[PDB]
Ligand SMILES: NC(=O)c1ccc[n+]([C@@H]2O[C@H](COP(=O)([O-])OP(=O)(O)OC[C@H]3O[C@@H](n4cnc5c(N)ncnc54)[C@H](OP(=O)(O)O)[C@@H]3O)[C@@H](O)[C@H]2O)c1
């Protein structure tokens with residue numbers, strides 16, 4: 001990884017952009033000539049290969065955290081996978097040519113970058129990145145970071161550990177599919193239960209759920225079984241706190257949290273991806289892609305529309321970029 005010739009890195013590129021808050025179907029526009037971000041000293045520039053969408057992208061675009069957002073206009077997209085093309089003077093972990101992936105924004109809700117991953121090139125902090133596992137495609141790798149890190153962090157916050165039981169509310173989405181796999185294969189849960197609708201129960205079982213609960217037919221909180229950990233990924237903490245054992249832990253990623261449940265917002269860290277590398281290399285934890293993935297870079301508006309339906313199974317990914 002010698003530096004790229006400087007004239008080989010463009011100063012403008014194609015990206016999706018919005019200049020005012022609103023629905024993606026109204027505000028999200030293709031711009032054939034936006035600035036490539038200049039990197040800071042602790043960042044790398046990446047040639048984006050694939051990007052995933054997350055609900056935060058559209059909630060952000062609606063203006064839900066405008067008071068702590070970065071200035072408009074915005075190029076959306078948190079998740080990235082691609083190839084390093086430039087490294088800042090303080091970077092030590094990556095060199096030009098490294099294949100990398102991560103969630104760009106250390107703090108999702110406070111000063112996320114203006115220059116997101118739905119662009120041909122993007123700038124990323126060294127600290128949010130990890131080396132792409134050789135056995136994963138760029139589509140697969142881009143699908144992972146925000147969701148798998150949120151799954152991981154919520155399970156750690158809930159103190160999950162070997163032999164304990166866990167109930168996952170929303171097992172079939174970007175986050176939930178990882179909550180199940182991590183709980184079973186990384187945290188050593190003795191029993192993993194999870195909720196989804198009728199046609200998604202077999203998927204939950206395939207990912208490691210011992211008990212798949214159809215929420216459209218029955219109410220988990222009325223079951224006599226109670227769990228050491230309940231991880232709410234839907235926003236049902238009122239009910240979640242009824243399913244936990246005394247002294248157990250309930251976490252949510254959708255607020256507000258009814259005590260004793262806690263809400264948190266993930267911190268994006270490349271070190272989490274690195275910790276999980278061996279599970280990703282062995283296939284014990286797999287990426288989960290929605291059957292409609294990938295969407296071409298021309299179809300980003302459609303990709304958001306599908307995500308906004310709340311029906312995605314695993315991840316919506318954009319490729320080729
Ligand atoms: N606080 C944080 O750090 C953080 C980080 C990431 C995400 N989030 C938030 O967490 C939530 C989940 O994000 P995500 O990326 O996993 O979303 P996602 O992929 O859009 O979730 C879609 C899935 O949700 C399932 N679902 C919807 N309502 C359900 C219910 N009542 N019960 C069980 N399953 C249900 C759907 O399955 P069915 O079709 O079977 O309903 C679908 O498979 C979002 O609100 C997001 O904004 C928070």
Ligand SMILES: C/C=C1/OC(C)=C(O)C1=O
Nearest residue numbers: 055056108253254255265
């Ligand atoms: C990615 C971060 C998220 O944080 C909150 C509170 C959401 O709803 C998100 O999607």
